[PDB]
Design a binder for this molecule. Sequence first.
Ligand SMILES: CC(C)c1cccc(C(C)C)c1O
Ligand SMILES: CC(C)c1cccc(C(C)C)c1O
Ligand SMILES: CC(C)c1cccc(C(C)C)c1O
Ligand SMILES: CC(C)c1cccc(C(C)C)c1O
Ligand SMILES: [Cl-]
Ligand SMILES: [Cl-]
Ligand SMILES: [Cl-]
Ligand SMILES: [Cl-]
Ligand SMILES: [Cl-]
Ligand SMILES: [Cl-]
Ligand SMILES: [Cl-]
Ligand code: NA
Ligand code: NA
Ligand code: NA
Ligand code: NA
Ligand code: NA
Ligand code: NA
Lengths: 311, 311, 311, 311, 311
Amino acid sequence: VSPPPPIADEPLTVNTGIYLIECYSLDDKAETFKVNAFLSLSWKDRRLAFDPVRSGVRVKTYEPEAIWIPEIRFVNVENARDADVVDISVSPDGTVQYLERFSARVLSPLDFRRYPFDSQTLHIYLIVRSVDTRNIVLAVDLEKVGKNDDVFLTGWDIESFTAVVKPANFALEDRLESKLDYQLRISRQYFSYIPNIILPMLFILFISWTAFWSTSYEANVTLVVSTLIAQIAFNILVETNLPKTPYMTYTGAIIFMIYLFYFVAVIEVTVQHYLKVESQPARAASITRASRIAFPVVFLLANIILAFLFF
Amino acid sequence: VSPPPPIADEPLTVNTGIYLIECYSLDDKAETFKVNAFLSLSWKDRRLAFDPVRSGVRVKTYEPEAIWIPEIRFVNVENARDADVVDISVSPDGTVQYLERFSARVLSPLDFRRYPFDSQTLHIYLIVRSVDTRNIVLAVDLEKVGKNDDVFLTGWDIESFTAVVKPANFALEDRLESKLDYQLRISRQYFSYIPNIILPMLFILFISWTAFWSTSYEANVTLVVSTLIAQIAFNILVETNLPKTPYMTYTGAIIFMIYLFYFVAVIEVTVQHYLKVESQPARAASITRASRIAFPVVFLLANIILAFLFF
Amino acid sequence: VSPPPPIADEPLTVNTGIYLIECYSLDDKAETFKVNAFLSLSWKDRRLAFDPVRSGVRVKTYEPEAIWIPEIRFVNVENARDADVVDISVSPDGTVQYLERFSARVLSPLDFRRYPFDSQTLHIYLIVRSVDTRNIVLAVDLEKVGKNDDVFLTGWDIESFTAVVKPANFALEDRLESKLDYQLRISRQYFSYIPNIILPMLFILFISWTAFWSTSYEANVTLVVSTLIAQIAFNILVETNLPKTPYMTYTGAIIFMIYLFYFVAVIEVTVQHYLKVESQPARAASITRASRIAFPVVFLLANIILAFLFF
Amino acid sequence: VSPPPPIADEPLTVNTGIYLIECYSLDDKAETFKVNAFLSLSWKDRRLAFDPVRSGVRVKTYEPEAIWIPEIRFVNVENARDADVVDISVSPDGTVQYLERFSARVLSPLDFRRYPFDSQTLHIYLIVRSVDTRNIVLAVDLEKVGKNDDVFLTGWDIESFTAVVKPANFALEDRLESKLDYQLRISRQYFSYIPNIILPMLFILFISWTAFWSTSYEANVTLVVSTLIAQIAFNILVETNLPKTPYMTYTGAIIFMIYLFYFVAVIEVTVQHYLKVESQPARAASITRASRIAFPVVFLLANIILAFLFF
Amino acid sequence: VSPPPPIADEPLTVNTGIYLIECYSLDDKAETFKVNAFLSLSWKDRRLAFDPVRSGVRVKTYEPEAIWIPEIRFVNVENARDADVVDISVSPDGTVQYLERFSARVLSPLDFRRYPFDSQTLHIYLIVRSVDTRNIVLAVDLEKVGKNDDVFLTGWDIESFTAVVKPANFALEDRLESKLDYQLRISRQYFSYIPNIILPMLFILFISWTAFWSTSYEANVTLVVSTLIAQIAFNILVETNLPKTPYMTYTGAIIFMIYLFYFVAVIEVTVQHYLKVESQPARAASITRASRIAFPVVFLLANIILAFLFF
Ligand SMILES: CC(C)c1cccc(C(C)C)c1O
Ligand SMILES: CC(C)c1cccc(C(C)C)c1O
Ligand SMILES: CC(C)c1cccc(C(C)C)c1O
Ligand SMILES: CC(C)c1cccc(C(C)C)c1O
Ligand SMILES: [Cl-]
Ligand SMILES: [Cl-]
Ligand SMILES: [Cl-]
Ligand SMILES: [Cl-]
Ligand SMILES: [Cl-]
Ligand SMILES: [Cl-]
Ligand SMILES: [Cl-]
Ligand code: NA
Ligand code: NA
Ligand code: NA
Ligand code: NA
Ligand code: NA
Ligand code: NA
C-alpha cells in the first residue's frame, strides 16, 4: 500500500489526539514517566470511498494491514510504544478514523532548581516523516485531547494536559518532519517533605545549639559531632532521590548552608574550650552568650536570603 | 468479522466474570499488584445458532479468529494483559462462552492514613468500547466471579472479591463505553510490625528516659543523642516502604511525636545541667523528679489522642 | 483439530513427567523460584494410527499445529511458561509422545518458623481442563520424573523431586480440572549464618556484659548503647532478607529476646549508678556481682527454652 | 533474494549514517548507555534500475521482504537492536536508500583514572559480514551522521558525534568483515561533586584538626574517631557509583590519602596523651603546635602532587 | 523436513564452534554471566548435494525453513538463547555450514574459597537430542572456537576459551544426548580490594590498638567500640557482594578472626581497668605492655596460618 494521492499539490493532514488513561512511575533520577493513553488519528483516503447502498454498511471497518496508515512515532520514548489497535473506521468519503491504545516510557527533562517546591512541564512529542510521493503534516483535533478524571501521578498534582496546535515542520536527512508537542503540567506535592525531612533537620540542628548553654567540651563535642552524623544521614537520604545537576538546587543550597553552620559551631565549641584552658573564661562566656542569639538569627536571615534567590 | 446484528434496537450485553488464581507482589510504594486470573465472557450471536438434532452436536468449539469477539480491556493496567484463550463454545441458540487465562500488573491507589493497621479495596476495571454498528454493554455473571482458596497475598488477609453489578456507561471520544468495577477487599497483617518496629522503638525511648535518673551531663548527652540515632535508623527503615503522601499517616504522626519527645528530653538534660553549674541543684532535682512521671504520662496520653484521631 | 474420540465413555489420560535441568533464584522475600525443565506428555490418538508395513516407518514425527495437543498449564506461575517443543512422535497404535523444554517463575509459599534451620517443599502444579466432547485427566509416568545431578539451588540442599501420582479432580467454571502436584523437597544451608550473623551477635552481646566489671557510668553507657547500635545493624540486615510473616520466626524470637537483654542491662547500669550517687556502693556491688552470673545463665536458659519451642 | 552481482570483481559498498535522537542511562558501574537513533543505509542494486520516462515515477518504494538488504549488526550491543524500518526508496540507477529507527543498549568501556573530572569516548561499532557470492564493505555518508540539538545525557556534556570514515576490515571465520567506528565524545558535569562530596569531606577533616587545639584525650578520641566514621560513609557512598578498576582513580587516591591523614592524627592524639601522662606536657605541646601547621601544609602539598600525577 | 539418512548405521556428526564477541555482567551473588557470541554448526546432508560444473555455482545459500537443521540447545541457560541466523551455505558434496549470532544468560557455579584472589572456570554446555530416525553426535571444529581481542569482563582477566573436544554421550528419557563443554578460564582483578577494603580494615584495627598506650578506660572503650562499628560497616559492604556459601571463604575467615581480635582487646581493656580500680596498676601495666607486642605478633602469625591453609 502507498499513501493517498493529492487532489492538487496539498500536504496530507493527519489529525491527532492523545487521551490519557494512566500516568505512573515519574522517576526523578531517570527523568522518565510511564503513560497509558489513547492515540487517535484521522486522515482522508479517497481510494477507500464507498457507496453504503452497494456495500450494505454506513461505515467500513478495516485491519491495519489492509489499508495505508501513516507511520506516527514518538520522539522522546525509551523504546517504541506498546500499541493495540482498538478500531479503524472508514466513512463513505474515505475519512479514516484510527484509534489505538498504547503504553510508553517517556524521557522528559526536569528542572530541580526549586525542588521540592518545584513544577514541571512534561512533553510527549508526536512525529511523522514525509514520504517521497507526498508531504505529511500533523494537526491537533482538540475534541480528542484530554485525560481521565482518575489520572493520579503519585506525589504530583496534574494541572493540565494540552497540545501546542502548531506543529514544528523541519527538514531532517533530506525529508520533511512534522512534530507535535503534547504538554502535561504537573506540580510536586511538597507536604511530606516538611514532617519527614525539613522538621527532623531543624530538631537535630537545635539539639546541636544546646552546646551554647554548656561549658563541658567533651559533652559539646559529643552533641555537635553526633548531630552532624544524623544530618549526614538525612543529606544522603535526600540526595539519593535526586539526579546530579550542573546547577545548585534549593535543597542542595540548604544542605550546604547547614554544613557551614555545623562547621562554625565546632569553631565556637573549640574557641570556648581553648579560652577556658588559657584561664580566660570571661572572654569565652562573652562569645557563647553571643552565639546563643547569633546562630538562630543568622540561620533565619540566611534562609530568607536563600528563599529569596530561589523563589 | 462484524458484531452480531440486533433483533430490535437493543445494546449487545457481554456477561463477564473474573476468577482469581493468584495474587502476588502488592508493592505499596508503587501502588501496584500482580494478578493471574480467568476472564470469562458470554454474549449471544444469532449468526452462530444451529439445530442440535440436525448437527448431531450439542456444543460447537471455535478458534478466536473464526468468530467475532468483543474487545474487552482493563482500564487500570500498566501494560495490556498477557492472555491465552482457554476455550470458545457456542450453544444451539448462538450463546457464545469465551474463557481466557491472563496475567496483569494492576495500578490501584492505596490509603495509608491508618498504616500499618490499614485495609484496602483494590480495583480491577473492565471496559468495552461500542462499535459504529451497535452499542456494547457489560454485565456481571455472579456464578463466574470468585477466587482460589489457596490465593495468598503475602502480608495481607483477603476479605472478599466481588463486582459492582451495575456498569458505569459514559461517552468517551464520541462513543459509548461500559465500565465494570471488580473489588478485592484486603487487610494488612500488622503482627510483625509490633515485635520488629513498634517494640524496638519503645525500648530505645525508655533507654533515653534513664537520663531522668542521672546527674551526669556527659552520660545523659550520650544516652539521648545515641538513642536518637537508633530512632532515626528505624524512621528511615519504616518510611522507605511507604510512598510520599499529601496527608499525615498514623505512623508518620507517631514518628513526628517521638522527635518532639527526644527534643524536649534534650531541653530537660540541658536545663538540669545549666542549674547544677549555676549552683542550683535543688531546682534541677525538682525538674528531673517531675520529668520521671511527666514524660511517660504525656507519652501515653499523646498516643491515646493520636489513636483516637486516626481510628 | 478436535480431541481424540473415545472408544467407549472412558476419560482421556495424559501421562506427564517433569525432568529438572536447572533450579535457580529462590527469592525468600518474593516466595518464588525459577525452573528450567523438560515437560513430557503422552496420550493415545486413534486417528493418528498406522500400519508399519505399508508405511515403511516404525514411527511418525509431527509439527504441533498438525495434530491435537492437550492444553496443559501450570497453576502457580507468575506468567505462562516459555516453552520450545523438542519432539512429537507417533507410534503405529497412535500413541503420541510429546516433549518440550520450558522455563518458568514459580510461586510457592514458604514456612519461615524455623528459619534459618528450615526445610521447604516447593510445588509445581500441572493442570488440564476438560472439554464438552470429553474429560481430560492427568497421570504421572514415574519413569519420566527426575532431575539432573548438577541441579544446584544456591544456599539450598535438594533432598528429592517427586510427584503425588493421584490427580485432584474438581469443577472450575462448569468444567472438570485435573491437577498434579510435583514436589521439590529442599533444606537450607545454615552454615554461613553461624560465622556471619549468630557469632557476631554473641560477641557484641558479651562486650556489653563487660559493663558488669565496671563502676564507670559514662563508660558503661557507651558500652551498652554502642553495642545496641551494632545489634540493630544486624537485625536490619537479617529482617531485610525475610518477608513480613503473621507468625513469630525462630530468628525473630531471638532478636526480640536480645532487645530485652539490652534493655535489662541498661536498667542494671542505671540502678548501679543511682546507688553509688546515693552513697550505697555496697548495695550496687551486690547487684553487679549477681548480674555477672544472672545474665549469661538466663541467656543460656532462655535460648534452650526457645530452641525447644521451635524445634 | 541474493546480493547484487558485481560488474567486475569489486566489493559492494554500503554507505552508512547514524543520526542520534536520544542518549540516556549512562551506567558507570555497568559501562553501558542506551541510544535511540536513525540508521541510514545506501547501496546500488543494478537489478532494481528503471527508466523514469516508461514508469512515470522518479522513485520506487519497496517492502524489506521484496528486495535484498545487507545484514548490518552492532558489535558492542547487549542484545540485538529493536528496529523499525521507516522507508526503502530506489532511484532510476538502482541506488537503494534504506532508513530504520532503532533503540539499543551499548557496551562501551570507560576510563575512570581522572573521575569525577573525566571525559569519555563512547563507541558504536557497525559491522557487515561478506557473503559467498560477494564481499561487502562499509562507508560513512558524512551528510547523514549527526545528533538532535535536544540530545541530553544526564550528568554529561556531549562534545561531538563523528565516525572514523575508514572501516577496520578483517577475516573472521574465513570471511571479510567490515567494521565502522561511530564515536560520541562526552565530558562529565563535575559541578555537583564539589558541594555534595568534596566540600563535606574537607569540613569533617577540618573538624578532626580541632583536636590540635585540645589537651583532652577523651574529646580528641571522640573528634577523630567520629569524623573518621563520617568519612567512611562518604567513601562508601562514592565507591558504590564506580566499578572495581585494576588501576588507581583520582578519587580513590584522595580517599586513600585521607585515611593516612586520619591514621597519623590518631598517632599524634595518642603520642600527646602518652607524654602528658609521663609528666612531659612541654614535649607534647611542641608536637601539637607543629601539627597545627604540618597537617594543613602536608595536606595541601600531597593534593598538589596528586593533581599533578593525574592531570 | 526429516534428518539426513545414514549411508550405513553411523551417527550424524555436528561440528560446532563458539566465537565470543562480548562477555559482560558476571554476577557473583547470582552465579551468572551474559554472553554475545557466534554459534557455528556444520554437518553433511547428501540430499543437498549438487554438481558444481552443471549448477555453475560453487556454493548454494538457503533459508533455515528450506532445509533440515539440528536442534542444538544450551544446558545451563536461564531462558533459551536469543538467536539470529547470519548464513546457511551448502557445498557440492552437501556439507552444510550454518552460522548464527546469539545472546544468552549463562548459569555457572563459582568457587569463592580463595575470594578475592580467586580464579574461575565458566562453562557453556552445548547439547543435542537424538531423533527416532538416527543418532546425533557433537564435535568441536577448533578452527571455529575463539574470542574477540576486545572481549573485556569488568573486574576479570580472561585467561582462555577452549572446548573439551570429547562430548559426553548419555541416555536421557529413553534417547541419546550429546553434550559439549566450552570452558572460559578467568581470574579476578584483586587490585581494588587492597586500597578499598584490606588497607582501611588494617588502619581502623591499628587505631583500636592505640588503646594499649592508654590508661583512660572511657577513651579506650570509645576507641575499641567505635572502630568495631567501622569494621562492621566494611564486613557488611564486603559480604553483600558474595552469595551464602556452605564453606568458609578466605575473606570470611579473616573477618571472623578480626571479630576475635576486637573481642580479646575488649577483655584486655576491661581487665586493665579492673586492676587499676583494685589498686593494682603495676599488674595492669604488665598486661598492656605485653598486649603492645602480643596483638600485632599474633595478628601477623594467624594471617600467615590462614593464607597457608587457603593458598
Ligand atoms: C510503619 C510501621 C513499621 C510503624 C512505624 C512506627 C510506628 C508504628 C505504629 C505505632 C503506628 C508502626 O507500626
Ligand atoms: C537471620 C539469621 C542469620 C539469624 C539471626 C539471628 C539468630 C539466628 C538463629 C540462632 C535464630 C540466625 O541464624
Ligand atoms: C567521586 C567523587 C564523589 C569524589 C570523592 C572523593 C574525592 C573526590 C575528589 C577530591 C577527587 C571526588 O570528587
Ligand atoms: C571481600 C574481599 C575483597 C575481602 C574482604 C575482607 C578480607 C579480604 C582478604 C584479607 C581475605 C578480602 O579479600
Ligand atoms: Cl513510538
Ligand atoms: Cl488489558
Ligand atoms: Cl503455563
Ligand atoms: Cl544489532
Ligand atoms: Cl586479516
Ligand atoms: Cl571473504
Ligand atoms: Cl538455548
Ligand atoms: Na498499513
Ligand atoms: Na562519647
Ligand atoms: Na474476533
Ligand atoms: Na494442536
Ligand atoms: Na531482504
Ligand atoms: Na529446519
